[PDB]
Amino acid sequence: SRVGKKIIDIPSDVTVTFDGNHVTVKGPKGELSRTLNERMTFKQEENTIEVVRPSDSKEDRTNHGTTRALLNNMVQGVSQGYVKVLELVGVGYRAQMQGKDLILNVGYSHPVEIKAEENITFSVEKNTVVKVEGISKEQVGALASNIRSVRPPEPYKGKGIRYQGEYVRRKEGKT
Amino acid sequence: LWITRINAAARQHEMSYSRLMNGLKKAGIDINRKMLSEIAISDEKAFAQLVTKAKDAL
Amino acid sequence: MKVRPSVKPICEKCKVIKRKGKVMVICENPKHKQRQG
Amino acid sequence: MRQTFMANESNIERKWYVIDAEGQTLGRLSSEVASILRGKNKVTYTPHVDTGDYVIVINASKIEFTGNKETDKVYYRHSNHPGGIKSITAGELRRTNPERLIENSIKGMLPSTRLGEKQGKKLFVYGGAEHPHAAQQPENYELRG
Amino acid sequence: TKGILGRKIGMTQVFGENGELIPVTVVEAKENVVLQKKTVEVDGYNAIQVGFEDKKAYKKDAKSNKYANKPAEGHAKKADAAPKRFIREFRNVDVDAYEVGQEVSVDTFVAGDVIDVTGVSKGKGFQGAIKRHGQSRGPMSHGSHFHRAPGSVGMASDASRVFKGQKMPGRMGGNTVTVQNLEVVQVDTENKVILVKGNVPGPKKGLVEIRTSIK
RNA sequence: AUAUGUUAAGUGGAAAAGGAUGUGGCGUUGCCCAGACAAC
RNA sequence: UUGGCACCUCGAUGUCGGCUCAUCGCAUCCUGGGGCUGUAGUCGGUCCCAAGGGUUGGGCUGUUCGCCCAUUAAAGCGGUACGCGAGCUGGGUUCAGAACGUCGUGAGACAGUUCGGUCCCUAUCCGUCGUGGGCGUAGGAAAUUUGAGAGGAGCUGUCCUU
RNA sequence: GGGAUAAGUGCUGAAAGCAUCUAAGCAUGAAGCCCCCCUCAAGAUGAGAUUUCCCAACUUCGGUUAUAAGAUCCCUCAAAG
Ligand SMILES: [Mg+2]
Ligand SMILES: [Mg+2]
Ligand SMILES: [Mg+2]
Ligand SMILES: [Mg+2]
Ligand SMILES: [Mg+2]
Ligand SMILES: [Mg+2]
Ligand SMILES: [Mg+2]
Ligand SMILES: [Mg+2]
Ligand SMILES: [Mg+2]
Ligand SMILES: [Mg+2]
Ligand SMILES: [Mg+2]
Ligand SMILES: [Mg+2]
Ligand SMILES: [Mg+2]
Ligand SMILES: [Mg+2]
Ligand SMILES: [Mg+2]
Ligand SMILES: [Mg+2]
Ligand SMILES: [Mg+2]
Ligand SMILES: [Mg+2]
Known part of the structure; x- marks a missing residue:
């Protein structure tokens, strides 16, 4: 080893x-x-x-x-500490804080609430950029993967929750 | 039935059936299974004595 | 995901692994995902 | 038909033992116990009467398995209705009704006669270290491994 | 919560608000008392038991059921009460109310509550296969000799037996059945009746058990 | 029961062409601390 | 499935389709959950998990099969003596009559058409559906109960908002 | 509606200084599995539990006698057959 x-x-x-x-x-x-x-x-x-x-x-x-x-x-x-950063891409995709919890608006017919947990702080930069900070690496990795699973990225246009340095393979499908 | 009872009586002296009648042959004893089963029921003190003569013949 | 009794690399970026007793290949394009069965 | 002792009622003595089951594998515990209940360690063993004595197993929730046979090793059952096959895994029985896990393993090692049913009623199995049978004054018994 | 006992009377109709017509079963639920409180410490489960309709006292030469006997007298005296005919238990209620010897009055239900009703069915006697089960009958002309019998009862020689649960004839009969999600429409205090919307199992002057809905 | 080793699949306790960084054993031959072989 | 072999049944294992009644498998027709797509969307194609439930009424044919009319979320493939005649029909076909074509010197035949042509049995045992009597359950009775186990139920469309 | 899972998606992560859903560990995930709903159920010979009622002498206790609480025979019936 x-x-x-x-x-x-x-x-x-x-x-x-x-x-x-x-x-x-x-x-x-x-x-x-x-x-x-x-x-x-x-x-x-x-x-x-x-x-x-x-x-x-x-x-x-x-x-x-x-x-x-x-x-x-x-x-x-x-x-x-550990910090993982992710972004929103799409028209009308707004995310905001409700104190401890987090509220998303990603094109569904209803908002989505992420209930907060211990040792982890959420923070929103400009209604697009969400930061997850904490002390144990497996814990912040789990919650950052949970909330990108609400709307994963999309091949044809790129819309959805994306990591801050994520590469997205794009297709070009025209009518 | 005789062998089952000899095997039970030998394991109270930490012997198998197999190693009892191995060492009992080398000591020179030529007693039955039937007679050996009756000594272990009737006279426990006599049965323990020929266990030792089989046990040191190994 | 292509399930077939013969899994092999196709291009030079694909790689062969095992997950829980099954042979798989993992590659960057999703058209090369194979698991043996 | 000269001379051979045959046991009898008014002739036999039954006593009480206690085995604890923690850190023991299931089948290797059970093979030892089933020879106690038949009486094959008595010097006065006779095949047509019930010599042999009572066994209590007290821990029974700490039985071990080897390999992967706590998610495998299912136990099947049929209700004599069409399509009535039912099952449960071995790990499931350990956490839920563990007394029936051990006593099914032991009664499978006893013969299916009238006497074999009566010998199997001398087994008492409990989860966790307490048993009610302090009046009968049982003894400890270590497994000849 | 909210158990009570009563017996069926009949069936009528009631005009609701704005002229809507609703069919109604009228149940007389009279003189119910709490008779024994059961406990998880003594018995292993919490419940109360309730006696419904009182009957005459002990007599020396009783030859029927309308006089209580000596075991029933002492049981219905330890709670200070008269001997009852029907006794059931309710383990859905909260046991921390209901002192022993209370009278559960009929207005523990308010109009609008959803309830479940339990009784035994009518009872029809020995009945055949197309009545007792919903079986199709054979043709009535074209030379047939097959009208109301059951059909085949199995395969040929693989499975040389009849499986169990085969739906042959027998006693149609009355057994216990519950209906769910009914309603209480109107509670009368003076006559001590309950009107329920719909219909409940049993013949007239039967015995029904009303309790609140589990869903 | 003694002594040495293999197997982790209940294989043992029903099958092939083919496929595979599954693990042991025995050989030949490349690049070796001058710094390889990876990642930067 | 069409066949090969000729091991049980010749002191009889007695019948194609349809009716009634079912039960099992999954190599899945619908519904459920996913991957890939040459997947913009709506629709689709292909593969994987999955057998809980559901899986149509008529015209022509003895018909199995098949064609067609209209519907449906869908109108799945197979096993059970090609499931079931001591539960039913008896249209078909190995019976006696008769006729056409063909063959035959002829009596007759085809395996080619057509009309007509008798379906027995009071259930002993196992088995299934329902209902009772006897004994037992360390005193005898009445009443209310726990629930080890077992059984049942398990489907789906259209419209309106977003 | 709750719990555990299938195909699958993942987090952290070595073996193999990289990468890796897995080897040790932590999650999620089907109308299918177990519970949840309805019914039968202590002949469950492992024969269960709570409440209430009743308690004899002879005697060679070998059994006899009369009996308690409670049942039945018999009669009038149906909401049941
Ligand atoms: Mg190929
Ligand atoms: Mg019909
Ligand atoms: Mg095998
Ligand atoms: Mg093989
Ligand atoms: Mg054949
Ligand atoms: Mg032959
Ligand atoms: Mg031959
Ligand atoms: Mg014959
Ligand atoms: Mg399949
Ligand atoms: Mg017509
Ligand atoms: Mg047939
Ligand atoms: Mg038949
Ligand atoms: Mg003729
Ligand atoms: Mg001619
Ligand atoms: Mg005629
Ligand atoms: Mg005619
Ligand atoms: Mg004809
Ligand atoms: Mg009347």
């Missing part, structure tokens, strides 16, 4: 607390926890965590690559 052997994992003012299997992580915007794995051994030289695989099997090789990946996401999101 060349990404598992790269087990430097330089911390910050975030505090790392081991508890055997499950590991708690707290910092500026912290309190994350995950029951990681039983086989993997954990060590901290001075503050940098480091992950060592035993037994060199096939199952031990793969999990050594993921366990380093999950720990790096748990500390870097407490450090900086």
